[PDB]
Short mmCIF file of C-alpha atoms in Angstrom, two decimals:
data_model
loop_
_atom_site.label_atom_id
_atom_site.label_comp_id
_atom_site.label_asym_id
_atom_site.label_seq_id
_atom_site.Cartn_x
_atom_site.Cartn_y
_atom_site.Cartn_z
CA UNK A 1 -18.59 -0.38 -12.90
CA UNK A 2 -16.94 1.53 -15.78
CA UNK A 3 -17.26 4.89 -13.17
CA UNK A 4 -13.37 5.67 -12.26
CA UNK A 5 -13.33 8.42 -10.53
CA UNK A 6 -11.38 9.49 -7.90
CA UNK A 7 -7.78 10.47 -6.45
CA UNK A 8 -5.82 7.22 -6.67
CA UNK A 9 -2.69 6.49 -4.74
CA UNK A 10 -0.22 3.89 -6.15
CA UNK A 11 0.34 0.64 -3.66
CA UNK A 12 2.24 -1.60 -5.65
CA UNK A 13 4.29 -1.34 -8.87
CA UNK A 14 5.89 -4.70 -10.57
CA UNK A 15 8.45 -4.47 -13.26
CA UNK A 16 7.59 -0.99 -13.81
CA UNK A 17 11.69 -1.65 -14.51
CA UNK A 18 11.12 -4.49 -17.16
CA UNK A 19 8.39 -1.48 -18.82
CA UNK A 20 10.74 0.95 -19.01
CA UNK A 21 13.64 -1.07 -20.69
CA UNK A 22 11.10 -1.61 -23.23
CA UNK A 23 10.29 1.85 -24.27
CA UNK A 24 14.28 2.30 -24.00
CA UNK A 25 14.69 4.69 -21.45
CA UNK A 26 17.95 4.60 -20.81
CA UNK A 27 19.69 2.85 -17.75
CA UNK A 28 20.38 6.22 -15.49
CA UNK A 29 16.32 6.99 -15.47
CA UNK A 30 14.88 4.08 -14.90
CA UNK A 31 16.95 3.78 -11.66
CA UNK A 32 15.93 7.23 -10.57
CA UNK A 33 12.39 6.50 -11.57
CA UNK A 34 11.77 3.43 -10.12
CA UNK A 35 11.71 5.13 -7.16
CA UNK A 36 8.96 7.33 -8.08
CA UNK A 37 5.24 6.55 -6.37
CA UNK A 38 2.33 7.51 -8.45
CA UNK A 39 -1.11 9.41 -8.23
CA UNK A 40 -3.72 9.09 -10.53
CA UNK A 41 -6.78 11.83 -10.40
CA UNK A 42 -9.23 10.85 -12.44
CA UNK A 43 -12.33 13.21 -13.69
CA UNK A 44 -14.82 11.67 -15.47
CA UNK A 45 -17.93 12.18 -17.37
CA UNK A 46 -19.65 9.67 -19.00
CA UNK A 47 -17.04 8.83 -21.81
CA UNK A 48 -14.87 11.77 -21.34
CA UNK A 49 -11.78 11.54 -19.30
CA UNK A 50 -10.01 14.36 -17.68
CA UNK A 51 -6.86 12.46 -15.70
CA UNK A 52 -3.90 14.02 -13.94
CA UNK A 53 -0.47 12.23 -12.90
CA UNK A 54 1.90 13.20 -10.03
CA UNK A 55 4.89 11.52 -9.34
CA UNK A 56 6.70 11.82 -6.46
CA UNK A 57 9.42 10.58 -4.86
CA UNK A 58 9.07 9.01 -1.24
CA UNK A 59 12.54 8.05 0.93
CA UNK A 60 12.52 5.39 3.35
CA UNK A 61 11.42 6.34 6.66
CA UNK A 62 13.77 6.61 9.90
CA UNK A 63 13.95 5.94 13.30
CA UNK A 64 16.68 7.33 15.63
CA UNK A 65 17.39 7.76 19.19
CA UNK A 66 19.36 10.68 20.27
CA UNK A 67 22.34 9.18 21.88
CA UNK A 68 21.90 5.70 20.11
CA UNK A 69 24.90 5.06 17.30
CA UNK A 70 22.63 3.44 14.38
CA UNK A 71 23.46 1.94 10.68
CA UNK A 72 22.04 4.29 7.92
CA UNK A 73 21.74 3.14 5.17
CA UNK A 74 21.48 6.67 2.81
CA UNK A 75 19.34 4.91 -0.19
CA UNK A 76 18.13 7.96 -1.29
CA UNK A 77 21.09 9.57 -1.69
CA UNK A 78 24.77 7.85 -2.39
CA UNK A 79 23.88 4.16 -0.98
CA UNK A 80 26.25 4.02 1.69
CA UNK A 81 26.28 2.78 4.97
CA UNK A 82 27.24 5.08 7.39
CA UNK A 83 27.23 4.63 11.72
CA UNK A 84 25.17 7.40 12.53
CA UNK A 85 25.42 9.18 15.74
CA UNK A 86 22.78 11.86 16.64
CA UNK A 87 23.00 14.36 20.44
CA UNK A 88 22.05 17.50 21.16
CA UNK A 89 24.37 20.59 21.46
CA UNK A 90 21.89 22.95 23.40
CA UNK A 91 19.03 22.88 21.42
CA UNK A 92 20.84 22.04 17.97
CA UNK A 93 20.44 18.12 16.76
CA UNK A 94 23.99 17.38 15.63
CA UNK A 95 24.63 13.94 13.52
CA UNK A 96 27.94 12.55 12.67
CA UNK A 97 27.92 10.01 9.70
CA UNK A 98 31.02 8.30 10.21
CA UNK A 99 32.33 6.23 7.02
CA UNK A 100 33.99 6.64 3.67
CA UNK A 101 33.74 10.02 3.25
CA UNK A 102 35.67 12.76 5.90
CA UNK A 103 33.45 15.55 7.68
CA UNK A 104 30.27 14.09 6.99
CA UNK A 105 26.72 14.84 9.27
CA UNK A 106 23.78 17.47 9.77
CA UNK A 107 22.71 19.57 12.08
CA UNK A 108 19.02 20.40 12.34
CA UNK A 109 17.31 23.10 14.39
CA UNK A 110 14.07 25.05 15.02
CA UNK A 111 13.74 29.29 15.26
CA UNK A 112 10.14 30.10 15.49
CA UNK A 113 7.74 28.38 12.42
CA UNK A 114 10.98 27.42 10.49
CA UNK A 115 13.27 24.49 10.98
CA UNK A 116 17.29 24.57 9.43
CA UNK A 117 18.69 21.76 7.82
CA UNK A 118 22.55 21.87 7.68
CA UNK A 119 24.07 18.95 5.65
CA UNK A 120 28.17 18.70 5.36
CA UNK A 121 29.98 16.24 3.20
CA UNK A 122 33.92 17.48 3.03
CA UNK A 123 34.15 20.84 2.53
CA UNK A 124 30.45 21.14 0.88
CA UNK A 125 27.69 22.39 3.20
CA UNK A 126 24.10 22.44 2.17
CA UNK A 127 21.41 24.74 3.96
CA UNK A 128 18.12 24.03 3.64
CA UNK A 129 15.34 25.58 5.25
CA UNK A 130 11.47 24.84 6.15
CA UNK A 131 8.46 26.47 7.04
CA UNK A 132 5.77 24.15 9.42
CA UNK A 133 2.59 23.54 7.49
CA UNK B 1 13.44 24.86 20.81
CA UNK B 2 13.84 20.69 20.68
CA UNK B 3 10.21 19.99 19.23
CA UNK B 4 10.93 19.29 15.88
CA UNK B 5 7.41 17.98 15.39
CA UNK B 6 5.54 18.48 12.32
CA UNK B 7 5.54 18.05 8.55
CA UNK B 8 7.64 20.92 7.25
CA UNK B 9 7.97 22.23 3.81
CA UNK B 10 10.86 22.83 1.81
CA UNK B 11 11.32 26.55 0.87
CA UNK B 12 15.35 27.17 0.06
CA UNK B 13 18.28 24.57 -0.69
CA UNK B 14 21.24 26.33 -1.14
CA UNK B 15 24.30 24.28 -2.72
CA UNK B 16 22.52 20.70 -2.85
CA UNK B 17 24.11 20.12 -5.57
CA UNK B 18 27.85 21.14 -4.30
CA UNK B 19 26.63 18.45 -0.95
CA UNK B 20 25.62 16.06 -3.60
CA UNK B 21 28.30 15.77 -5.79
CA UNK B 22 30.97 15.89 -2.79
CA UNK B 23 28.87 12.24 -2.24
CA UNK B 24 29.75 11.37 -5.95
CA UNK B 25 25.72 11.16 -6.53
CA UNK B 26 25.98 10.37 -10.49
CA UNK B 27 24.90 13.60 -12.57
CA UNK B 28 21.40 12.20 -13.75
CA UNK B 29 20.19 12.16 -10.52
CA UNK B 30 21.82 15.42 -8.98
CA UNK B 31 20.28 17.19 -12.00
CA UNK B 32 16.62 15.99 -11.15
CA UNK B 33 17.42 16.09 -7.25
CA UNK B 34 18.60 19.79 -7.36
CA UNK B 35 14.96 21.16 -8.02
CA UNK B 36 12.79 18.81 -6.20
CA UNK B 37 10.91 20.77 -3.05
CA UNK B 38 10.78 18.62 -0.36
CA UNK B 39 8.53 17.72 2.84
CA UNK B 40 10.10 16.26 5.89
CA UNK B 41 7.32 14.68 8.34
CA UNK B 42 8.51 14.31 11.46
CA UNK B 43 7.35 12.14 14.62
CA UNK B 44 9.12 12.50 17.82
CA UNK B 45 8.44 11.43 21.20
CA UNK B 46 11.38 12.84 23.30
CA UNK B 47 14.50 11.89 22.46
CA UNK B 48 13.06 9.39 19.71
CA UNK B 49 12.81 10.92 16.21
CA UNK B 50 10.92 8.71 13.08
CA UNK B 51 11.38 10.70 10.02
CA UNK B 52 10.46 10.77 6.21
CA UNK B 53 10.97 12.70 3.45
CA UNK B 54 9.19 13.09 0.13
CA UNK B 55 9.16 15.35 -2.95
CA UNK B 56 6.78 15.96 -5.61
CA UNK B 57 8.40 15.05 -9.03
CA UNK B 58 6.25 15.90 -11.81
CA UNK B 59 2.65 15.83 -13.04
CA UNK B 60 1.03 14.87 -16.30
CA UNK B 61 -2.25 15.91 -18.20
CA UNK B 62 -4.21 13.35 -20.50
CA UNK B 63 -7.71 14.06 -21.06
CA UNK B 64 -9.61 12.05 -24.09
CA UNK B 65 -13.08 10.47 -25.38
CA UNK B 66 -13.50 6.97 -25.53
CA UNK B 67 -13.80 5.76 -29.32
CA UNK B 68 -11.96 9.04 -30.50
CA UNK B 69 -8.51 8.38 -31.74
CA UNK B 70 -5.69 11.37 -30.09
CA UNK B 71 -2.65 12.08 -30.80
CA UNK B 72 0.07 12.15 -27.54
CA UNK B 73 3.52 12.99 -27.14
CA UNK B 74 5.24 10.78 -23.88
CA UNK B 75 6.99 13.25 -22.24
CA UNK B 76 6.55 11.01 -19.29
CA UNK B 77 8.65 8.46 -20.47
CA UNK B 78 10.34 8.20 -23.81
CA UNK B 79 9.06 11.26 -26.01
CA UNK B 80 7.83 9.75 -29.07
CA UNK B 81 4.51 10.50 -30.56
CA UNK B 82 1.58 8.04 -30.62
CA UNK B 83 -1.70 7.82 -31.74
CA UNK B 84 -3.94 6.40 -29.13
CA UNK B 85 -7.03 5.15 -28.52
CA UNK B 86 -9.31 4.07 -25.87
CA UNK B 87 -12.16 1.49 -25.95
CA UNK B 88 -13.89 -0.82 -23.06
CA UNK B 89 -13.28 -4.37 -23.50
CA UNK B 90 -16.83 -5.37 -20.67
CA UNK B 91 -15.83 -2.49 -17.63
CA UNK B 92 -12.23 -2.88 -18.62
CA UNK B 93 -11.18 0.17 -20.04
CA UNK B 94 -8.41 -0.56 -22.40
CA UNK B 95 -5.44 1.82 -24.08
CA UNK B 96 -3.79 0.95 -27.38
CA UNK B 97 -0.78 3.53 -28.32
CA UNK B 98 -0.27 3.18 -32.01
CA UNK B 99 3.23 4.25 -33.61
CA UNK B 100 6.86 2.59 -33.62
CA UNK B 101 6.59 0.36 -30.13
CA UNK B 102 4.69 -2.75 -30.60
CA UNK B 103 2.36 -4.22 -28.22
CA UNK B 104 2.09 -0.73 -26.80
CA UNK B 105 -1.19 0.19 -24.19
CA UNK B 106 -2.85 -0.09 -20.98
CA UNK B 107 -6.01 -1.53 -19.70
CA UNK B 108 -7.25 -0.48 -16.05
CA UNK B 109 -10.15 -1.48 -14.21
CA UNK B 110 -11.75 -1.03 -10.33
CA UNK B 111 -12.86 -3.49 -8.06
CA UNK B 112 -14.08 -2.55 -4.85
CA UNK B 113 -11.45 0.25 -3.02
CA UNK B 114 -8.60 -0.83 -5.77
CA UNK B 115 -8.09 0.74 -9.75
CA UNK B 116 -5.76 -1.91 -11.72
CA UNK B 117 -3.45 -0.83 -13.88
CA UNK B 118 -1.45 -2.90 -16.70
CA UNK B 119 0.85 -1.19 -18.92
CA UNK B 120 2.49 -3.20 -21.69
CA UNK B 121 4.88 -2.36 -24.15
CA UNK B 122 7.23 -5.29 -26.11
CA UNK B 123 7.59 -8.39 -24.63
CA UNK B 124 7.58 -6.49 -20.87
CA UNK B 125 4.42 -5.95 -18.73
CA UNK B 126 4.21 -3.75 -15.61
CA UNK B 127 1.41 -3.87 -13.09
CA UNK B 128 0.36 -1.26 -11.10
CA UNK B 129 -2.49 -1.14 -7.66
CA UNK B 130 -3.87 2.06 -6.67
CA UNK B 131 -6.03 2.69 -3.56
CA UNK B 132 -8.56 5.10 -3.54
CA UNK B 133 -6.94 8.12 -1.25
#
């Protein structure tokens, strides 16, 4: 059938890598956007195409256990392996990364629709915050 | 409260990048990281969290006729201008991007649930599976 329409959700990419070399983006990119997963939406009429391309980017999932000192391995942010440690402080859920770097965890939390994201890393603290779709 | 159920959407990130860099993330990606809003889906059952994360990167327009030649700028990739043009080789629809790359296109075809996707530039071929979503 030559009828391709439809939202289209990438599965599988090979040497999407190899591809990019080739059209010489340069080595920084192509490590960032090899990690990218696509969608392709597709509107079609007879011989006229109408297509749209989203990229996004999709981190490896987790699984902790409060209590339960894990290996992360952080591959979506600086590679490193850290001996995670996750408990609650009340109603706060405090994690300790210990490894290389000093003074290094979260702490994540929930006030009404909107959940807190603390993140430290030495004397840098990043807040983020969420509302529940 | 300790539910932190529910797929949660990124609306403030204060100092990401001051977090990021403190983890010695190289510049290219803190610079495409800063801006990205994310979604955090989260599954917990008690004390047992399973997490991920994504983040919507960018999206693309490229509308055409099959048989009429375009002109297209890949701001997607490497930014250079190419003339394409799109034919269908049997229900294969196929891509040639004329300009300074050689060997340059795509062809993409659906079977069943699945769109194929080949993209080819020099010597280098990528391959790409989409599911219908």
């Amino acid at each position: 059938t030559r009828d391709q329409n439809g939202t289209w959700e990438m599965e599988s990419n090979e040497n999407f890598e190899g591809y990019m070399k080739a059209l010489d983006i340069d080595f920084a990119t192509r490590k960032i956007a090899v990690r990218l997963t696509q969608t392709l939406v597709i509107d079609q009429d007879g011989d006229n195409f109408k297509t749209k391309t989203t990229s996004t980017f999709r981190n490896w999932d987790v699984d902790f256990t409060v209590g339960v000192e894990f290996d992360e391995y952080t591959k979506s942010l600086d590679n490193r392996h850290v001996k995670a440690l996750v408990t609650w402080e009340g109603d706060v859920l405090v994690c300790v990364q210990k490894g290389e770097k000093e003074n290094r965890g979260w702490k994540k939390w929930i006030e009404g629709d909107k959940l807190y994201l603390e993140l430290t890393c030495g004397d840098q603290v990043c807040r983020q915050v969420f509302k529940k779709k």
